[PDB]
C-alpha cells in the first residue's frame, strides 16, 4: 500500500487522541463526544450551552492556545431534530495544530455568539444567519451579508431549491428591476447518480 495510498500519520493520531481526552476531562460539563478521524483531525462535539466556555478555553489555555478561528460553518442535516450543525475550525499556531468544535441547534434555539472569543466570527456567524437562519444571541450587528436586500428564505438550508423562488428582470413599464416567480426555460436536470451497491463496508450501518 505504498505508492497510491495516503500514508497514515499515527503520531498525530495519538497526540490528538491524548489532547481530546484532555479537553473531555477538563470540560465534562459540555463535551459530548470526542473523535479523531483516520486522517488525524480532532473533533470536539459539545453541547450548545458551552460555546463560550469551550472556545474561551481553547483560545486561552496554555496547553491549547488556539488563537486563530480558521472557519465557522453550519451544516443543514434535515433528518436531525437539531438540523443545524455549527462547526468551529480552530488553529493553534503555538502547537501547530487544528481542532474542530461542533455543536447543534434547530430553527428556533439561538446559539450564543462567539464574537467575545473570536472577532473573526463577526461575519461568519452573520453569514450563518443569512444562509441558514441560525440566530446568534448578543451579536453586535446581526443582519444579512450575502443575499439581496428583500430576500426571503435561508438558501443553504437543504429544503431551499437550487434556483430560488423569485428571479429578477428589468421591466420598462415601471422603469425598474422587478422580482417575479422563477420560470426556467430549461429545468435543472436532476441526476440520480448513486450506485445501488455498497461502496465502503467499513461504514456499514447496523440495520433495523
Amino acid at each position: 500500500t505504498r505508492p497510491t495510498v495516503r500514508p497514515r500519520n499515527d503520531v498525530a493520531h495519538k497526540q490528538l487522541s491524548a489532547f481530546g481526552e484532555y479537553v473531555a476531562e477538563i470540560l465534562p460539563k459540555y463535551v459530548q463526544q470526542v473523535q479523531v478521524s483516520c486522517f488525524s483531525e480532532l473533533e470536539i462535539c459539545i453541547h450548545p450551552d458551552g460555546v463560550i466556555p469551550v472556545l474561551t478555553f481553547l483560545r486561552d489555555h496554555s496547553n491549547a492556545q488556539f488563537k486563530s478561528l480558521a472557519d465557522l460553518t453550519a451544516v443543514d442535516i434535515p433528518t436531525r431534530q437539531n438540523r443545524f450543525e455549527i462547526v468551529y475550525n480552530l488553529l493553534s499556531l503555538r502547537f501547530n495544530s487544528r481542532i474542530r468544535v461542533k455543536t447543534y441547534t434547530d430553527e428556533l434555539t439561538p446559539v450564543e455568539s462567539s464574537v467575545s472569543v473570536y472577532k473573526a466570527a463577526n461575519w461568519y456567524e452573520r453569514e450563518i444567519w443569512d444562509m441558514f437562519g441560525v440566530f446568534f444571541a448578543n451579536h453586535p450587528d446581526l443582519r444579512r451579508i450575502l443575499t439581496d436586500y428583500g430576500f426571503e428564505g435561508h438558501p443553504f438550508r437543504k429544503d431551499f431549491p437550487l434556483s430560488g423562488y423569485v428571479e429578477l428582470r428589468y421591466d420598462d413599464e415601471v422603469k425598474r428591476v422587478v422580482a417575479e416567480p422563477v420560470e426556467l426555460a430549461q429545468e435543472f436536470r436532476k441526476f440520480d447518480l448513486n450506485s445501488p451497491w455498497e461502496a465502503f463496508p467499513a461504514y456499514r450501518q447496523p440495520p433495523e
Binding site: 430549461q186 435543472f188 436536470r189 441526476f191
Partner: protein, 176 residues
C-alpha cells in the same frame, strides 16, 4: 528559513545623513523612477497587431465546440450522453433514437454556449472523440440565441474546422 523585510537601522554618521538629505532635497529616487519610465520609453513595445497578428495558442486550447466525424463521413457521436452527464454547467442536451439503419445516433445535441464553462470535460468524457472543443475563439454574436448551438450547428463547426481539429488532436492525443 525566514527573513526580515524592513528591519534596517539607517546609519547616523554625517555621510549617511547628508546622503539622505540630498535624497530629500534633490529628489534622487524620483529621478530614478523617471529614469526607469524613460527606459521603457525607448523599448520596443509588446503590442501585437491584432487582427493581423495573433496571440500564440497551444493545441490544447479550448474554444468553440464541434461534433466530429470518422474518415468516412459517419458522425462519431453514438449518443451515449457521457458528455452531458459530466457537464458541470449542464450545457449539453441530448436526445437519441435508433435511426433508419438501426444505428445509435442523436436527434438532439444542443450546447448552450452561454451556460458552457469551456472546461472541456465533455471532450475528455467522450469515448469516441465526437465532441471536441476546437480552436475557434472568435465567434462573438450579436444575439443571445445565436449562442444556442444545436446539432446542425455543431456538425457544421466540425465540418468547418476539422482540418485543424484533427491536427490538434494529432499533436495532443499522446498526452491524453
Amino acid at each position: 528559513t525566514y527573513k526580515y523585510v524592513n528591519l534596517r537601522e539607517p546609519s547616523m554618521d554625517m555621510k549617511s545623513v547628508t546622503d539622505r538629505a540630498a535624497q530629500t532635497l534633490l529628489w534622487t529616487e524620483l529621478i530614478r523612477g523617471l529614469g526607469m519610465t524613460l527606459s521603457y520609453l525607448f523599448r520596443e513595445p509588446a503590442t501585437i497587431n491584432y487582427p493581423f497578428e495573433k496571440g500564440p495558442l497551444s493545441p490544447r486550447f479550448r474554444g468553440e465546440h464541434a461534433l466530429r466525424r470518422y474518415p468516412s463521413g459517419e458522425e462519431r457521436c453514438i449518443a451515449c450522453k457521457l458528455c452531458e452527464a459530466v457537464c458541470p454547467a449542464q450545457a449539453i442536451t441530448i436526445e437519441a433514437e435508433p435511426r433508419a439503419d438501426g444505428s445509435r445516433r442523436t436527434t438532439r445535441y444542443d450546447i448552450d454556449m452561454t451556460k458552457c464553462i469551456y472546461c472541456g470535460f465533455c471532450q475528455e468524457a467522450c469515448p469516441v472523440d465526437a465532441i471536441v472543443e476546437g480552436p475557434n475563439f472568435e465567434f462573438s454574436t450579436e444575439t443571445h440565441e445565436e449562442l444556442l448551438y444545436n446539432k446542425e450547428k455543431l456538425l457544421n463547426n466540425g465540418d468547418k474546422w476539422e482540418a485543424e481539429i484533427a491536427a490538434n488532436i494529432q499533436a495532443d492525443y499522446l498526452y491524453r
